[PDB]
């Protein structure tokens, strides 16, 4: 999403979490933070809905 934005993802504010260690507690933490960043993207997408076209 941040190296080749294939759509309008370049206009929303978020950050992907980076993992520190080779383990799955940390990977669990990055999953949960990706969920919360998805919530942020949903809030900004509700605030930026154009009435264009189907």
């Amino acid at each position: 999403r941040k190296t080749q934005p294939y759509d309008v993802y370049d206009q929303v504010e978020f950050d992907v979490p980076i993992g520190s260690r080779g383990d799955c507690y940390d990977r669990y933490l990055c999953r949960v933070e990706e969920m919360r960043q998805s919530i942020r993207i949903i809030s900004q997408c509700l605030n930026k809905m154009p009435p264009g076209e189907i």
Binding site: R36, Q37, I39, R40, S43, L46, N47, M49, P51
Partner: protein, 68 residues
């Protein structure tokens, strides 16, 4: 007119904080109140056991005087 589904003038924000209260006692306070109730139980235990030994000695004296 047109009748799509727009947002009405902008909507409210929604939080993204890991909202944690971390409440409860500290180490020292919880530790001290546990040890304090422990020592309270010890003092009452000591009192009841020594009065109980008094009564059990009375029971011994009953069997002594009863025997011959």
């Amino acid at each position: 007119v047109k009748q799509d589904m727009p947002p009405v003038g902008g909507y409210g924000p929604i939080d993204y904080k890991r909202n944690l209260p971390r409440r409860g006692l500290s180490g020292y306070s919880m530790f001290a109140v546990g040890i304090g109730a422990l020592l309270f139980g010890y003092w009452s235990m000591m009192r009841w056991n020594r009065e109980r030994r008094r009564l059990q000695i009375e029971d011994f004296e009953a069997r002594i005087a009863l025997m011959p």
